[PDB]
RNA sequence: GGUUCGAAGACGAUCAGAUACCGUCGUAGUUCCGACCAUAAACGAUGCCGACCGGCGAUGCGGCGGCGUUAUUCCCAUGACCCGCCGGGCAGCUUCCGGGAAACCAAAGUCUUUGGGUUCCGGGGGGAGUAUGGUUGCAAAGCUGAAACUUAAAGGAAUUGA
């Protein structure tokens, strides 16, 4: 987003929905920022690190927030691939 | 949820689900809840897949553990069935319970007495608790729901496919979320089975209360 | 337009030409009838002889006599 | 009847992209559609696609990335001379930074910026931004 | 402005339905436009039954009924209060009124 | 004049832990306090009343006139807000309209016409905004063109800090309730438009409630 | 014609909400505690509020009175008829487990339990309601 | 050919009047056969062909798979129910698909991010579907169809009143 010289000029960079790959508008109030906790392999206990996801307003009220969160988690290997 | 033998579904937990009757969905089926259903019976009731119940329940447990301050998780049930279970969950974890009649504008109205401002919503039945979901449209607020086969997944981000109708089923599903949150946190051990009996969560209707008030007397 | 074919030019041209008569101001300027009916005959001004004076009464709310002249 | 096949194919992609679908099956596969989609891929608006042979007109399954605002067609195929490619790319495309007019020339099917460089005018197919 | 979806009538995919004479007037209304009503009535009203239950020659002769199907035009139906005007919302309710007793 | 915060992020702002409107706009937080906008963009925010409009409702004993004031606010460096408000006095109609205009300000995105030298002066691409019948379109123009538009979009785009813009309006624009709402929706869409610059995959920062969680547990109930 | 107004009901509900610790089932005891805790300028309104307090709190004891919910305190008050069950209502023996559910468990590894009795299936698919 | 009904008619009422509504009769007509007529709120007030874009439960015709009930007792095999699937068709309910001035619409969507093909047709309200010519018809009348003049509004959906 930079000029001829190479100076990043726009006053901020908006987030993009993990499911749809739309940019989450400055006032898309039905957009979520959901942290799914990362668990230690040997104990099964919380580490203090998380696998964060963003989703757009249209996707949520479409009713595809459930399957999209699921598929992102199953891609990361949080949910078992077998499922 | 998976790739781990520690978070794996135990032979103890299966008998608890079958005894409560959480594997049994409704007669009618939603189009976005097909992936959580094994098969339809002769009698025409849908059998919910208990692995896919467990995978989503652990995903929900993870999402609740990642929230740091435990008192900006609002737990909700408007009907009779959940009112005990959410208060038990609330006291046991530190989550803030809204039991019976969610007044419209607790997240939207600044001037209200009960102007709450949570970071995660856990809901018993989207059809009954439709107002907290429709209101969590106005605030950037992820939603968890005890969704039945009949449930619409509009404004629901992780739907745990269960029976949310039966009084035993609601009680246990709240109990296993309450326990997995505490285990993952590192408060209870996976070595020992949990102190609390799941009947501490169940809804005793006045009829059962009066019959037992004569029984024990 | 509607008919978009690459050899659809006489259709478009002829159609617009037919439909421009249904325009009021076009047909007014392009028929002879208006410039026959115009007293001045398509002129800026016109000279005439005064033959009587007239008091033309106004319409509703405006009540007055507008002092015109027959020419 | 089905007069234009590229018109159907681009409306199918456009409808699927708006609805937020992750891949779309555009049916009556043709040399012009494939050569259109290769150009669209080389700039990186679509993903990798897989063309499915039944012993007929084939099918195409296009893996969609959510970075495609519009993919349209111009019918009829107007004969764009090189100097007039300015007034075309002026009134079709959003800005002078991004977006492409793909037009079928002597050399082959290629975007306005390539055709301007190669010094060739030709018949317009469509646009994608 | 469009008031009904089904233009006050239960014709969808015909073109023509033969008309009927109203039972109050003799006004020609189409067969499906008309407000139809089926009155199944005892011949003897309410108290007459008791007097004819005693002054009958026979033993538990279940005295007959009177079956009359009535077609009303919309004006005759509204005037006789067989139907009434309704709210914009309530207009769409097609479930007939409960007849519990 | 003591502003005690009612909202959770009204607390984090007054405690000087969030130090930009970009922290808010990035995480799409609803701004319910009128004082957060007066905190950050307090200096350069300038009001202009677009119109006062008397709207009536019929009763059996006379009409009941109440006044509706349209207010466009914004620093001339990439924020506009348009607020409307009805009241029995024109004074409290303006006062409420100003407050609502502050509540609902958006960041505008600015780009270049062709060559990418200096600071961004025009709209990054062709954007259209609709309200009722009115359709306002904003097109990028070369440098030092000025704003080729009607007075109403001109003054909104002036306050937005866009210098160069060709415009084209259709519908019943005589209604300047819908005109300016159409312009504001057109302006507001510039940051919710995916150009090939916003292609680089996003890296996720902590939301300010997760960031300053431990502070908000002790600071207030 | 004895319908109590908003001022009676609201203020009585607020006093039950806060001071549930002292209020009782006797009228004259809670009349005195109400006079002590609350500044009510007239004596008639004092008796009206105290009268409502010792009618709501005579029904809190019964069951799920709506307009108030002191959750910890009302639930600890529901923890006065203590039914702590000794055997879990779930922890049972032989379970009737649907020949369809047999496979559902068998597609998980645990298709082999002691207390999974498979009841014969309901022949005749007549689970629907007539459209008459 | 003329049973019923019934424009014009004839009277009887009603009313200030009633050439009307109400009543009693009643001619052309209402019916059939053979020749004309070519218009209707001839309506979904919504051209036809093709593609894509949500959900749900019924319904009519055809096909396919499936526990079981029932009729042919002798049941193979046919019908009647029962539970799903596929393709056309008349519709329905639902929704922030999306559109629209709104009412409302899975099309009236896929439209300033504007182009799949093609026929007909509208350009403020009146004058006016009027005059005039031409044409079809036995006639009634149909199709084509202006101008001078006049006027700042007529109008569409929705809101609050009365
Ligand atoms: Mg007809
Ligand atoms: Zn009638």
Residue numbers in the entry:
A (entry chain W): 1 to 83
B (entry chain B): 2 to 218
C (entry chain Y): 2 to 72
D (entry chain X): 2 to 130
E (entry chain b): 2 to 102
F (entry chain D): 58 to 278
G (entry chain S): 2 to 133
Question: What does the paper behind this entry write?
Answer:
The 5'-UTR of the (+)-ssRNA of the Dicistovirus CrPV harbors an IRES that is able to direct initiation towards ORF1 in the early phase of infection. Three domains connected by flexible linkers could be defined: an elongated domain I (DI) at the back of the 40S head contacting ribosomal proteins uS3 and RACK1, a second domain (DII) formed by a dual hairpin at the back of the 40S body interacting with eIF3, and a third, large helical domain (DIII) placed at the periphery of the 40S E-site, contacting ribosomal proteins uS7 and uS11. Interestingly and in contrast with the HCV-IRES, the conformation observed for eIF3 in the complex with 5'-UTR-IRES is very similar to that observed for eIF3 in the 48S complex, with the IRES ‘filling up’ cavities that are present between the 40S and eIF3 in this canonical complex.
Two main classes of particles containing density for 5'-UTR-IRES, 40S and eIF3 were found in the dataset. Both classes contain density for the 40S, the IRES and the core subunits of eIF3 (a/c/e/k/l/f/m), and class-2 also presents density for eIF3 subunit d (eIF3d). Class-2 exhibits a 40S head in a swiveled configuration. In class-2 (closed conformation), the head of the 40S exhibits a medium-range degree of swiveling when compared to the widest displacement reported. In the swiveled conformation, the latch is open, and the channel formed by ribosomal proteins uS7 and uS11 is plugged by eIF3d, which in this class presents robust density. In the swiveled configuration (class-2), the 40S head brings eIF3d close to eIF3a, one of the core subunits of eIF3. Well-defined density in this area could be observed for the eIF3a–eIF3d interface (right). This compact state of eIF3 represent a hitherto unknown conformation. The 5'-UTR-IRES exploits the characteristic swiveling movement of the 40S head to bind and progress towards a conformation that ‘locks’ the IRES onto the 40S, and at the same time, induces a compact conformation of eIF3 that has subunit eIF3d in close contact with the core subunits of eIF3. A swivel movement of the 40S head closes the channel between the head and the platform of the 40S, effectively ‘locking’ the 5'-UTR-IRES into the 40S and inducing a compact conformation of eIF3 with the eIF3d subunit in interacting distance with eIF3's core subunit a (left top).
